[PDB]
Design an enzyme around this catalytic site. Structure first.
Site, PDB file in Angstrom:
ATOM      1  N   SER A  45      -4.515  -9.385 -15.841  1.00 47.88           N
ATOM      2  CA  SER A  45      -5.722 -10.024 -16.330  1.00 47.88           C
ATOM      3  C   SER A  45      -6.896  -9.923 -15.374  1.00 47.88           C
ATOM      4  O   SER A  45      -8.019 -10.241 -15.793  1.00 47.88           O
ATOM      5  CB  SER A  45      -5.530 -11.521 -16.625  1.00 47.88           C
ATOM      6  OG  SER A  45      -4.712 -11.769 -17.793  1.00 47.88           O
ATOM      7  N   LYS A  48     -10.282  -8.170 -16.321  1.00 52.85           N
ATOM      8  CA  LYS A  48     -11.283  -8.776 -17.194  1.00 52.85           C
ATOM      9  C   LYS A  48     -12.612  -9.023 -16.482  1.00 52.85           C
ATOM     10  O   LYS A  48     -13.668  -9.033 -17.120  1.00 52.85           O
ATOM     11  CB  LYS A  48     -10.767 -10.083 -17.776  1.00 52.85           C
ATOM     12  CG  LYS A  48      -9.555  -9.862 -18.711  1.00 52.85           C
ATOM     13  CD  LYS A  48      -8.854 -11.131 -19.105  1.00 52.85           C
ATOM     14  CE  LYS A  48      -7.618 -10.846 -19.964  1.00 52.85           C
ATOM     15  NZ  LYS A  48      -6.855 -12.074 -20.279  1.00 52.85           N
ATOM     16  N   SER A 105      -8.546 -16.684 -19.732  1.00 52.30           N
ATOM     17  CA  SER A 105      -7.684 -15.508 -19.819  1.00 52.30           C
ATOM     18  C   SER A 105      -7.221 -15.153 -21.244  1.00 52.30           C
ATOM     19  O   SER A 105      -6.110 -14.694 -21.465  1.00 52.30           O
ATOM     20  CB  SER A 105      -6.498 -15.659 -18.884  1.00 52.30           C
ATOM     21  OG  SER A 105      -6.212 -14.370 -18.293  1.00 52.30           O
ATOM     22  N   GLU A 141      -4.741  -5.047 -24.224  1.00 51.62           N
ATOM     23  CA  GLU A 141      -3.859  -6.202 -24.159  1.00 51.62           C
ATOM     24  C   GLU A 141      -2.913  -6.140 -25.354  1.00 51.62           C
ATOM     25  O   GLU A 141      -3.380  -5.811 -26.445  1.00 51.62           O
ATOM     26  CB  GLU A 141      -4.626  -7.514 -24.193  1.00 51.62           C
ATOM     27  CG  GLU A 141      -5.436  -7.822 -22.956  1.00 51.62           C
ATOM     28  CD  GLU A 141      -4.571  -8.166 -21.764  1.00 51.62           C
ATOM     29  OE1 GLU A 141      -5.148  -8.430 -20.671  1.00 51.62           O
ATOM     30  OE2 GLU A 141      -3.315  -8.196 -21.863  1.00 51.62           O
ATOM     31  N   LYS A 209     -10.332 -14.870 -10.435  1.00 51.28           N
ATOM     32  CA  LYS A 209      -9.584 -14.529 -11.613  1.00 51.28           C
ATOM     33  C   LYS A 209      -8.181 -14.147 -11.231  1.00 51.28           C
ATOM     34  O   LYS A 209      -7.994 -13.308 -10.320  1.00 51.28           O
ATOM     35  CB  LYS A 209     -10.251 -13.402 -12.397  1.00 51.28           C
ATOM     36  CG  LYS A 209      -9.517 -12.945 -13.662  1.00 51.28           C
ATOM     37  CD  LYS A 209      -9.772 -13.928 -14.770  1.00 51.28           C
ATOM     38  CE  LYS A 209      -8.829 -13.720 -15.939  1.00 51.28           C
ATOM     39  NZ  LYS A 209      -7.545 -14.456 -15.751  1.00 51.28           N
ATOM     40  N   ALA A 212      -1.022 -11.992 -14.274  1.00 51.95           N
ATOM     41  CA  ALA A 212       0.453 -11.913 -14.199  1.00 51.95           C
ATOM     42  C   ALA A 212       0.982 -10.863 -15.147  1.00 51.95           C
ATOM     43  O   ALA A 212       0.361 -10.596 -16.168  1.00 51.95           O
ATOM     44  CB  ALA A 212       1.080 -13.269 -14.534  1.00 51.95           C
TER      45      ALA A 212
HETATM   46  C1  LIG Z   1      -3.333 -11.814 -17.574  1.00 51.14           C
HETATM   47  O1  LIG Z   1      -2.768 -11.402 -16.566  1.00 51.14           O
HETATM   48  N1  LIG Z   1      -2.683 -12.304 -18.664  1.00 51.14           N
HETATM   49  C2  LIG Z   1      -3.291 -13.362 -19.544  1.00 51.14           C
HETATM   50  C3  LIG Z   1      -2.666 -14.786 -19.323  1.00 51.14           C
HETATM   51  N2  LIG Z   1      -3.160 -15.563 -18.179  1.00 51.14           N
HETATM   52  O2  LIG Z   1      -3.198 -14.874 -16.987  1.00 51.14           O
HETATM   53  S1  LIG Z   1      -3.135 -15.737 -15.705  1.00 51.14           S
HETATM   54  O3  LIG Z   1      -2.586 -17.136 -16.014  1.00 51.14           O
HETATM   55  O4  LIG Z   1      -2.219 -15.087 -14.688  1.00 51.14           O
HETATM   56  O5  LIG Z   1      -4.572 -15.819 -15.178  1.00 51.14           O
HETATM   57  C4  LIG Z   1      -1.143 -14.729 -19.221  1.00 51.14           C
HETATM   58  C5  LIG Z   1      -0.606 -13.670 -18.281  1.00 51.14           C
HETATM   59  C6  LIG Z   1      -1.226 -12.417 -18.742  1.00 51.14           C
HETATM   60  C7  LIG Z   1      -0.674 -11.547 -19.663  1.00 51.14           C
HETATM   61  N3  LIG Z   1       0.639 -11.323 -19.632  1.00 51.14           N
HETATM   62  O6  LIG Z   1      -1.421 -11.013 -20.480  1.00 51.14           O
END
Ligand SMILES: *C(=O)N1C[C@H](NOS(=O)(=O)O)CC[C@H]1C(N)=O
Ligand SMILES: OC[C@H]1O[C@H](O[C@H]2[C@H](O)[C@@H](O)[C@H](OCCCCCCC3CCCCC3)O[C@@H]2CO)[C@H](O)[C@@H](O)[C@@H]1O
Length: 265
Positions: A45, A48, A105, A141, A209, A212
């Protein structure tokens, strides 16, 4: 704490995975601490922020407006879409989409914005235009988080991401208002910002930001500094560790504690 580099090493050993990190002066671009800074890590993420940099560059060029309302459909949506699932009926503006993507996110918001910049190929081309020849987006995504071992898709390096973030925030490639907007979206992160502030000493600035992915992939891009000022960019990525989300979070926090303790360098 141990020195930063000592703690970073310890983290990597304890995680049984790879850590990549840059600490960079925001004003000058000087690299202060680096560990695996030229090795590839999934952005997750964290991409972004660069995405909304590309959006803002289109606004500056007269090719986009933050006020422009995007109506979208339910069939368009992907996993993790807390904000975009609320606005099927009435849509979201480009600017609201960036706020949702960076501050909550929201993955579907990120895909809608990716459409507007020419998809992963278009964002990659924007990266090349601002002089980042390393970072690449290949997928949308949520497949961009797959983090397959040794797969270069959807990766950056700590050094490239830090340099790119500095370019977007400070170089006047973006207009003054756009630089200020991008920064404010990171200041407003609801996912990790308030949690980070709860463990930061009084007086320390944070904007961030996080991301994961699979196989323990975890990351943060941040601005940090004492005296309530954004003094340094800090980029930390983790990959290929079997550790819990909690231990990955704690290890990143430990590296942050070491940077704070030994700030003057
Ligand atoms: C980004 O990495 N994604 C969106 C969502 N939130 O990310 S964060 O909490 O690590 O800022 C869940 C994890 C993720 C994804 N798997 O798309
Ligand atoms: O002398 C420096 C400071 O040392 C301690 O602060 C501790 C703090 O009590 C703890 O909660 C934190 O954990 C680290 C929290 C890190 C959160 C930011 C992490 C992000 C930011 C940038 C991107 C990577 C990680 O460490 C510091 C430094 O030891 C004292 O509590 C504080 O009063 C004192 O001002």
């Amino acid at each position: 704490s141990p020195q930063p580099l000592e703690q970073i090493k310890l983290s990597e050993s304890q995680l049984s995975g790879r850590v990549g990190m840059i600490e960079m002066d925001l004003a000058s671009g000087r690299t202060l601490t680096a560990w695996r800074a030229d090795e590839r890590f999934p952005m997750m993420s964290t991409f972004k922020v660069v995405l909304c940099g590309a959006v803002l560059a289109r606004v500056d060029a007269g090719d986009e407006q933050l006020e422009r309302k995007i109506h979208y459909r339910q069939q368009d949506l992907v996993d993790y879409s807390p904000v975009s699932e609320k606005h099927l009926a009435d849509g979201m503006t480009v600017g609201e989409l960036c706020a949702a993507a960076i501050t909550m996110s929201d993955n579907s918001a990120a895909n809608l914005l990716l459409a507007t910049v020419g998809g992963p190929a278009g964002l990659t081309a924007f990266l090349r235009q601002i002089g980042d020849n390393v970072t690449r987006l290949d997928r949308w995504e949520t497949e961009l988080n797959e983090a397959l071992p040794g797969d270069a898709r959807d990766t950056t390096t700590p050094a490239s991401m830090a340099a790119t973030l500095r370019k977007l925030l400070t170089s006047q490639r973006l207009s003054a208002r756009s630089q200020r907007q991008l920064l404010q979206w990171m200041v407003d992160d609801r996912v990790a910002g308030p949690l980070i502030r709860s463990v930061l000493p009084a007086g320390w600035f944070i904007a961030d930001k996080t991301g994961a992915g699979e196989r323990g992939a975890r990351g943060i891009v941040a601005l940090l500094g004492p005296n309530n000022k954004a003094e340094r960019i800090v980029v930390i990525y983790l990959r290929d560790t079997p550790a819990s989300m909690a231990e990955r979070n704690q290890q990143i926090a430990g590296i942050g504690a070491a940077l704070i303790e030994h700030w003057q360098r």
